[PDB]
Amino acid sequence: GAARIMLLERTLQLKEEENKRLNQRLMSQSMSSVEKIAIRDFQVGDLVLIILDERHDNYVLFTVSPTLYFLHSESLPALDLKPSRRPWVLGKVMEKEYCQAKKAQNRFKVPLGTKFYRVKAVSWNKK
Amino acid sequence: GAARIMLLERTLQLKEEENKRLNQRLMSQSMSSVSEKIAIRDFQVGDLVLIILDERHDNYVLFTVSPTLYFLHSESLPALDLKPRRPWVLGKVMEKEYCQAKKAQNRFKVPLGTKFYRVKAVSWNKK
């Protein structure tokens, strides 16, 4: 009986310490929740550098990766890009689509069966 | 002391329920929570930059879409396996110095009186 009461008081103190620790952790996590370009894993809202590729006749997002990210045909004219012309521009990625070259003679100048991304992006100016 | 033991069991049960509710709140907060980068404009020490070869000026330059020119340091060049012929590589900036072209026959091929930066940076390897 005495052992049960002592154990219950000890575990109750342990639970109280846990309650203080968890409440303080919650307050700290709520406290800590609050111009650079993305290079690798592309997500919507990321800042990217669109450069002109000539080997493939298109504009491609700067990528330090084997996968090729091309710019979408509808996204080209929106940022005053003419269908030679400008070497690079800065933008913000809005949507990405996984595509594959089903035809050997394509506009992307990629070999047959190559999988790549097509990105719809909009220009991004400083704020 | 059965009454005392039961009182302690109830109080312990209440405290553990409070702790579990706080833990569920923490998990909900963590789930509501969201989920490298290159510096292009104003470089400060420790930023990841993209060193590319410039052809007009016989040097490697940090990519900048800004009027000021950031050159790579002559001594830092061989450290990141660039010989004074990779096209580009990315590194981490370690120190910058504000300089001005005092002679018309300078190595940077900048006009007389041009102000620029010289940055010593080190290669960057991803884990």
Numbering used by the authors:
A (entry chain B): 1455 to 1488, 1494 to 1542, 1550 to 1593
B (entry chain A): 1455 to 1489, 1494 to 1542, 1551 to 1593
Study text:
The formation of autophagosomes requires the hierarchical action of a number of conserved factors, including the upstream-acting ULK1 complex containing the scaffold protein FIP200 and the downstream-acting conjugation machinery, which catalyzes the conjugation of the ubiquitin-like ATG8 proteins to the head group of phosphatidylethanolamine on the isolation membrane. Crystal structure determination shows that the FIP200 CTR contains a dimeric globular domain that we designated the “Claw” for its shape. The interaction of p62 with FIP200 is mediated by a positively charged pocket in the Claw, enhanced by p62 phosphorylation, mutually exclusive with the binding of p62 to LC3B, and it promotes degradation of ubiquitinated cargo by autophagy. The Claw is constituted of a six stranded, mostly antiparallel β sheet and a short α-helix.
To gain mechanistic insights into the FIP200-p62 interaction, we determined the X-ray structure of the FIP200 CTR (aa 1458–1594). Crystals of this construct diffracted to a resolution of 3.2 Å and the phase problem was solved by a single anomalous dispersion approach using selenomethione-substituted crystals. A monomer of the FIP200 CTR comprises an N-terminal extended helix of 29 amino acids and a C-terminal globular domain of 100 amino acids to which we refer as the “Claw”. The connecting linker between the helix and the Claw is resolved in two out of six monomers. Accordingly, the Claw shows some flexibility relative to the helix. The six monomeric Claws in the asymmetric unit superimpose almost perfectly, with a root mean square deviation (rmsd) of their Cα atoms of 0.33 Å. Homodimerization of FIP200 CTR is mediated by the Claw (interface-1) and the N-terminal helices that form a coiled-coil (interface-2). The linkers cross each other in such a way that the Claw of one monomer sits on top of the coiled-coil helix of the second monomer. Dimerization buries an extensive surface area of 1,440 Å2, suggesting a physiologically plausible assembly. Along with these results, analytical size exclusion chromatography coupled to right-angle light scattering confirmed the dimeric nature of FIP200 CTR.
